[PDB]
Design a protein around this ligand. Structure first.
Ligand SMILES: CC(C)CCC[C@@H](C)[C@H]1CC[C@H]2[C@@H]3CC=C4C[C@@H](O)CC[C@]4(C)[C@H]3CC[C@]12C
Ligand SMILES: CC(C)CCC[C@@H](C)[C@H]1CC[C@H]2[C@@H]3CC=C4C[C@@H](O)CC[C@]4(C)[C@H]3CC[C@]12C
Ligand SMILES: CC(C)CCC[C@@H](C)[C@H]1CC[C@H]2[C@@H]3CC=C4C[C@@H](O)CC[C@]4(C)[C@H]3CC[C@]12C
Ligand SMILES: CC(C)CCC[C@@H](C)[C@H]1CC[C@H]2[C@@H]3CC=C4C[C@@H](O)CC[C@]4(C)[C@H]3CC[C@]12C
Ligand SMILES: CC(C)CCC[C@@H](C)[C@H]1CC[C@H]2[C@@H]3CC=C4C[C@@H](O)CC[C@]4(C)[C@H]3CC[C@]12C
Ligand SMILES: CC(C)CCC[C@@H](C)[C@H]1CC[C@H]2[C@@H]3CC=C4C[C@@H](O)CC[C@]4(C)[C@H]3CC[C@]12C
Ligand SMILES: CC(C)CCC[C@@H](C)[C@H]1CC[C@H]2[C@@H]3CC=C4C[C@@H](O)CC[C@]4(C)[C@H]3CC[C@]12C
Ligand SMILES: CC(C)CCC[C@@H](C)[C@H]1CC[C@H]2[C@@H]3CC=C4C[C@@H](O)CC[C@]4(C)[C@H]3CC[C@]12C
Ligand SMILES: CC(C)CCC[C@@H](C)[C@H]1CC[C@H]2[C@@H]3CC=C4C[C@@H](O)CC[C@]4(C)[C@H]3CC[C@]12C
Ligand SMILES: CCCN(CCc1cccs1)[C@H]1CCc2c(O)cccc2C1
Lengths: 268, 56, 231, 231, 337
């Protein structure tokens, strides 16, 4: 029975996400050389992936383990949807915020240099969490309270909210993160032309892991809302949902493997 | 010449000193430490009402 | 160093006036400022305070909301705005310097004063009202308070001032033991934390005047009635 | 706690002035200026602008402020006073690139600076100065360089070379040989913590302030990309 | 040259023989029997966090409550250590300050650094603001250390290899002390202020009579530059810290090394040194960002102060021994018990 593979995979996923995002949090708490206004965004990302592995992954795993049946209260399904939609969206907006941070660091380099504090860090990090709450809030506004909302399963169901929340959470941040990394890369080319290598490699890894985790989910998910008649396999919907959460395990890796001071700490 | 001249005079000035045997001089540091050990809040941490550097 | 008050004179009661005080020869922005009354032939009475950089303001209840105190550091200037007035308000008003940090002496310098003529608290008491005495003799003057002035930090917030005839007051002692700068070693003070003494080891003709105690444990600041020394 | 409350408030007034100064201390770039006795750095400072132990030259480019510290009356044992400059945005090292026997001493100084344990993080901007004199000496054929750098005749102009229009093959081989003799030092023990930015410059060129501005912009880009983990 | 150099070498050998003739024990033998300092924990009771750049120096007022601290931001700050209040912040004329002192009265503080001038600031002005009373200009290399004897005279140390004593009213060198060969790094006054001792980038320390202007004794045994120096509280021994990673203690009276303080894993230079009020503890501040507390009789490491993120640059124990403060290139000071 594949529910056992979903349990084992769920425990491995929760382990990987909790461990990896704890390594971030403990390192930036303990090493003052890591405690930079640049790394503030990387902690804010890891914090979303920790809350997602605490407040959301265990119930998603338990649901998938009982074959996608929901057997708990309807308001717990509503809470779990609002919690998932916020913490998923916080993770994505934190990837987008890191991409603004890296762009300003190359586009306007003298203003960025360790002058950090209220205006960039606290405005932009606050905007990620607040805007994630704003995306999630229509779930606790009770759009699930409509007729025919069968309690035997847990999901979003409003076509309009699914389109607009997908549009806001994936479909605007994906172009922003792409154009910001393209403009960051082009900014380094302008600089190497004007003054008359690792950055040429890492931006493909950052963008690749984002697109591979989140394009399959958000395209499948918006396909259902655009097309109720489309015969999406339920196991596809499961698999792309799992693949969305794989991002929370890759985030610790991608935002600290390349960084020389995290590399220096993890050499110990 | 004045460089070597002032060296040999300064060296004579340091040669003619009434140096004392190190056992006695060491014992005097040991005696001073004992005599003032009661008076040293780093050596003997005082109770919190006497320490002006209390916690908030 | 100078403080020079301006405005004053005749007021009809329901009217209004603005006192100004102009500072020179000191770094005015660094000091908090106080205004102090002296009603005619009566003791001192504090009215208002502003901090360095205006961050705190206090008033006596006899003036709260009815007077307002204001500042102009770029012009080394202090103001008091008298929104409506009474027979209760005729006094000389002194502009007074103060600065607060560990070991500082606030109230150390006072302006010449300007006269305005109109057409719980810690109670502070001096048992004496006058003492007749001659030069070279020693004296004591005593003061007592309704609350102890000994704070838990170990300070004792008692200030002693002398005013000579026709002068503004001068600081003698800022906390019971601490003698001011530029005053004779002849003055010395001490106390229990609820009753207090100012002592003079030997008098001189320069000591003739009225001696005021004042607390600075908490606002409103309160003076004793003042003890005269007479020849 | 009335006096302590006022002492805390003036401590806050000080912290406001410290944070107002943290802004300018962050915003300005500090540059240690170094060179031999025969170096022309005392002319470079005029190009920047237009018993005392240190000189501060102030200049700006594109509204970015530079303080350049030419270390003044000090002895020839830098190993102690140099530790102060563990802060700086860059070192600027200035050399009479003018075929001296003393060019070997300038290479020994550059090696001593580049390998100093307190300077491991700090980039050197490198000015090969007075190259108008190098051009005059080499065009006159009175240059001696192989006679005390016994590898110039074996060395040849790199494809890295980008000479100015009309510069002679010997003049260009000479400037780039001297340039590479410094880079042969920096590339040996440099590990990407710090970089060397060589330039060719003369007693009168205006571009020195732009050379500094461009190279601090590069040094700051490398610092920012290191903080991002992107370089 | 040679005819005097043979007498100089003879006298150096004679002095070494005289030191050796006095070596009837070692302090490690005399103190072998006494009980150790039981290992001392200390906790950061205050942290002072105003400075914009690396702290180079700090000094306590005689009241054991106020302290003054200097940094490359170009500021002195005076701290009420009990409340953590900033009592004054003084903008310096040169950013590159390397040293700092109180007058024993608390009326004045002094600075010096890479501008060779020693600047003296008057705290007790009628005008309320702190201002420079005088600039002592006659040094020809950086000031490394300043100490007041009283409000009218200060002893100073420099990279020009001299120490000098000044009259503050005149602004003039009342005496100059010249026997050092390297940059003089630090001073300490004896408790009576009749003597002072200094160490100077030539692995040697010199004792001087303030009142005569002459070197009285010379001390050697370091492998490298002396950064730090401090009298033991009885006033007739002193300790030094150096780039060779050893602290070392000497008597004046026995005129030689008593103890070396080192441990095999301590590879790095000592920036600063001080003693507890009994003399029983050395405290030494190091590169590798921490302080070691030593039993100044037994030479055991009695404890560690671990709180700093960058180089510990200075130490000072209050005159009543009630605390130690550490300053650092991390721009903080921390106060310990
Ligand atoms: C960075 C990596 C190593 C973190 C760990 C990811 C692991 C736990 C992931 C990667 C691929 C995942 C599997 C992909 C697809 C499915 C089908 C689904 O209907 C049940 C769960 C199951 C079988 C997943 C379980 C979890 C899984 C094994
Ligand atoms: C479920 C909801 C309510 C939880 C919201 C928690 C949010 C606000 C928390 C979680 C992690 C936090 C961040 C963790 C680390 C840093 C780095 C520091 O240099 C600035 C603050 C900053 C950027 C924090 C800001 C607030 C933060 C983003
Ligand atoms: C409930 C949990 C799992 C979700 C949030 C993750 C945790 C680990 C977050 C929440 C608050 C965060 C801390 C808050 C702010 C700071 C200060 C900053 O200078 C360094 C990072 C540091 C120290 C953060 C580390 C990570 C942190 C502890
Ligand atoms: C992991 C921590 C930090 C956060 C999540 C806590 C979870 C496990 C808690 C929060 C609310 C809880 C539920 C609250 C109410 C009910 C209804 C009851 O008839 C069966 C148990 C059930 C369904 C609980 C199971 C456990 C539960 C889902
Ligand atoms: C830091 C914050 C975000 C942590 C939140 C903790 C989680 C476990 C809390 C937040 C909101 C809570 C839910 C709010 C309302 C209800 C309806 C009630 O009839 C059953 C329990 C249930 C479904 C709660 C279960 C626990 C819950 C999901
Ligand atoms: C929730 C979060 C992710 C929303 C982010 C909104 C984006 C579009 C905003 C936030 C901050 C903005 C940047 C702030 C500063 C600059 C520098 C300027 O020279 C070019 C534009 C640029 C780079 C801005 C472009 C737009 C920007 C990146
Ligand atoms: C971008 C990569 C992953 C390839 C997939 C492209 C996406 C955009 C494609 C794949 C399948 C498509 C859907 C297939 C069928 C229908 C039903 C039709 O009546 C309206 C359009 C709609 C709803 C399409 C919208 C676009 C769609 C979702
Ligand atoms: C590597 C990633 C991008 C793979 C995922 C691509 C997505 C867009 C693809 C994979 C499988 C596809 C589905 C396969 C089968 C059907 C049934 C048909 O009646 C309507 C379209 C529909 C529902 C397709 C829509 C697009 C789809 C969901
Ligand atoms: C972006 C890429 C690399 C993600 C990983 C590969 C994807 C394409 C794989 C992983 C798990 C796979 C699914 C697993 C199970 C089923 C059920 C089966 O009856 C039809 C195919 C379907 C629905 C598979 C389609 C392809 C799938 C989604
Ligand atoms: C990888 C988890 C993805 N979740 C899936 C919903 C779940 C089903 C069962 C348990 S949790 C989405 C739901 C839709 C949505 C959205 O429209 C906008 C922003 C975020 C999300 C999050």
């Amino acid at each position: 029975g594949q529910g056992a593979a979903a349990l084992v995979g769920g425990v491995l996923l929760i382990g990987a996400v909790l461990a990896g995002n704890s390594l971030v949090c403990v390192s930036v708490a303990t090493e003052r050389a890591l405690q930079t206004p640049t790394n503030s965004f990387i902690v804010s990302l890891a914090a979303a992936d920790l809350l997602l592995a605490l407040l959301v992954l265990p119930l998603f795993v338990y649901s998938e383990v009982q074959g996608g049946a929901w057997l708990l209260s309807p308001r717990l399904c509503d809470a779990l949807m609002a919690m998932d939609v916020m913490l998923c969206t916080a993770s994505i907006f934190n990837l987008c915020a890191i991409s603004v941070d890296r762009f300003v660091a190359v586009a306007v380099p003298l203003r960025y240099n360790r002058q950090g504090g209220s205006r960039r860090q606290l405005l932009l990090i606050g905007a990620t969490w607040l805007l994630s709450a704003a995306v999630a809030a229509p779930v606790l506004c009770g759009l699930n309270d409509v007729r025919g909302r069968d309690p035997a399963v847990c999901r979003l169901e409003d076509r309009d909210y699914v389109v607009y929340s997908s549009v806001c959470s994936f479909f605007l941040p994906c172009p922003l993160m792409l154009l910001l990394y393209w403009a960051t890369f082009r900014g380094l080319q302008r600089w190497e032309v004007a003054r008359r290598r690792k950055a040429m490699r890492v931006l493909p890894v950052v963008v690749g892991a984002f697109l591979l985790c989140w394009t399959p989910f958000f395209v499948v998910h918006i396909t259902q809302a655009l097309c109720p008649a489309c015969s999406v396999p339920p196991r596809l919907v499961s698999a792309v949902t799992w693949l969305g959460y794989v991002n929370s395990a890759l985030n610790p890796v991608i935002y600290t493997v390349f960084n020389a001071e995290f590399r220096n700490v993890f050499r110990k | 010449i004045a460089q070597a001249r002032k060296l040999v005079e300064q060296l004579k000035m340091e040669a003619n000193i009434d140096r004392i045997k190190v056992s006695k001089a060491a014992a005097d540091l040991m005696a001073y430490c004992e005599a003032h050990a009661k008076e040293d809040p780093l050596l003997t941490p005082v109770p919190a009402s006497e320490n002006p550097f209390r916690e908030k | 160093v100078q403080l020079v008050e301006s405005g004053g004179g005749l007021v009809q009661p329901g009217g209004s006036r603005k006192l100004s005080c102009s500072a020179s020869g000191f770094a005015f922005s660094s000091f908090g400022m106080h205004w102090v009354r002296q009603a005619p032939e009566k003791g001192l009475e504090w009215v208002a305070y502003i901090s360095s950089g205006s961050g705190t303001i206090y008033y006596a209840d006899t003036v709260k909301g009815r007077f307002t105190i204001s500042r102009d550091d770029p012009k080394n200037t202090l103001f008091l705005q008298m929104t409506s007035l009474r027979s209760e308000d005729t006094a000389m008003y002194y502009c007074v310097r103060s600065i607060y940090y560990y070991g500082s002496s606030p109230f150390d310098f006072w302006g010449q004063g300007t006269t305005l003529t109109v057409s719980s608290d810690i109670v502070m008491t001096q048992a004496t009202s006058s003492v007749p005495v001659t030069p070279g003799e020693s004296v004591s003057i005593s003061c007592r308070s309704s609350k102890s002035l000994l704070h838990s930090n170990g300070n004792t917030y008692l200030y002693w001032f002398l005013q000579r005839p026709g002068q503004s007051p001068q600081l003698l002692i800022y906390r019971m033991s601490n003698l001011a700068s530029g005053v004779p070693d002849r003055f010395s003070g001490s106390g229990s934390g609820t009753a207090f003494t100012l002592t003079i080891s030997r008098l001189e003709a320069e000591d003739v005047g009225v001696y005021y105690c004042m607390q600075h444990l908490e606002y409103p600041l309160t003076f004793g009635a003042g003890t005269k020394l007479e020849l | 706690s009335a006096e302590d409350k006022a002492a805390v408030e003036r401590s806050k007034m000080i912290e406001k002035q410290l944070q107002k100064d943290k802004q300018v201390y962050r915003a300005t770039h500090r540059l240690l200026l170094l060179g031999a006795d025969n170096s022309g750095k005392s002319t470079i400072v005029k190009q920047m602008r237009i018993t005392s132990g240190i000189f501060e030259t102030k200049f700006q480019v594109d509204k970015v402020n530079f303080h350049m510290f030419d270390v003044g009356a000090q002895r020839d044992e830098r190993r102690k006073w140099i530790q102060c400059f563990n802060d700086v945005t860059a070192i600027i090292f200035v050399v009479d690139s003018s075929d001296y026997n003393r060019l070997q001493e300038a290479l020994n100084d550059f090696k001593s600076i580049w390998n100093n344990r307190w300077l491991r993080t700090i980039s050197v901007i490198l000015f090969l100065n007075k190259q108008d004199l190098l051009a005059e000496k080499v065009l006159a054929g009175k240059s001696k360089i192989e006679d005390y750098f016994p590898e110039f005749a074996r060395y040849t102009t790199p494809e890295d070379a980008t000479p100015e229009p009309g510069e002679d093959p010997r003049v260009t081989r000479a400037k780039y040989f001297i340039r590479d003799e410094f880079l042969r030092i920096s590339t040996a023990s440099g590990d990407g913590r710090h970089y060397c930015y060589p330039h060719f410059t003369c007693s009168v060129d205006t571009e020195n302030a732009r050379r500094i501005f461009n190279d601090v912009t590069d040094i700051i880009i490398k610092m920012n990309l290191r903080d991002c983990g992107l370089f | 040259l040679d005819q005097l150099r043979q007498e100089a070498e003879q006298l150096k050998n004679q002095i070494r023989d005289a030191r050796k003739a006095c070596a009837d024990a070692t302090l490690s033998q005399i103190t072998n029997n006494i009980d150790p300092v039981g290992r001392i924990q200390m906790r950061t009771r205050r942290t002072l966090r105003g400075h914009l750049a690396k702290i180079y120096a700090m000094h306590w007022g005689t009241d054991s409550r106020l302290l003054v601290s200097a940094s490359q931001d170009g500021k002195l700050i005076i701290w009420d250590s009990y409340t953590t209040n900033k009592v004054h912040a003084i903008p310096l004329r040169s950013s590159w300050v390397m040293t700092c002192a109180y007058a024993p009265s608390g009326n004045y503080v002094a600075c010096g650094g890479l501008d060779n001038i020693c600047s003296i600031y008057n705290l007790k002005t009628r005008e309320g603001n702190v201002r420079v009373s005088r600039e002592l200009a006659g040094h020809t290399g950086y000031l490394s250390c300043c100490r007041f004897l009283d409000d009218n005279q200060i002893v100073t140390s420099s990279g020009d290899t001299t120490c000098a004593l000044w009259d503050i009213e005149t602004g003039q060198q009342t005496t100059t002390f010249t026997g050092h060969t390297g940059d003089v790094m630090s001073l300490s006054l004896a408790p009576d202020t009749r003597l002072f001792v200094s160490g100077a980038c030539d692995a040697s320390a010199k004792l001087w009579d303030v009142r005569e202007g002459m070197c009285r004794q010379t001390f050697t045994g370091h492998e490298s530059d002396i950064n730090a120096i401090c009298f033991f509280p009885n006033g007739n021994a002193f300790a030094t810290g150096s780039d060779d990673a050893t602290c070392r203690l000497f008597d004046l009276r026995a005129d030689q090394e008593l103890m070396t303080y080192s441990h095999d894993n301590i590879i790095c230079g000592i920036t600063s040194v001080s003693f507890s009020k009994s003399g029983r503890l050395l405290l030494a501040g190091y590169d590798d960002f921490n302080c070691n507390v030593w039993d100044a009789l037994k030479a055991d490491r009695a404890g560690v102060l671990a709180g700093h993120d960058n180089r510990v640059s200075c130490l000072g124990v209050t005159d009543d021994g009630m605390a130690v403060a550490t300053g650092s290139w991390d721009s903080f000071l921390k106060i310990w018990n």
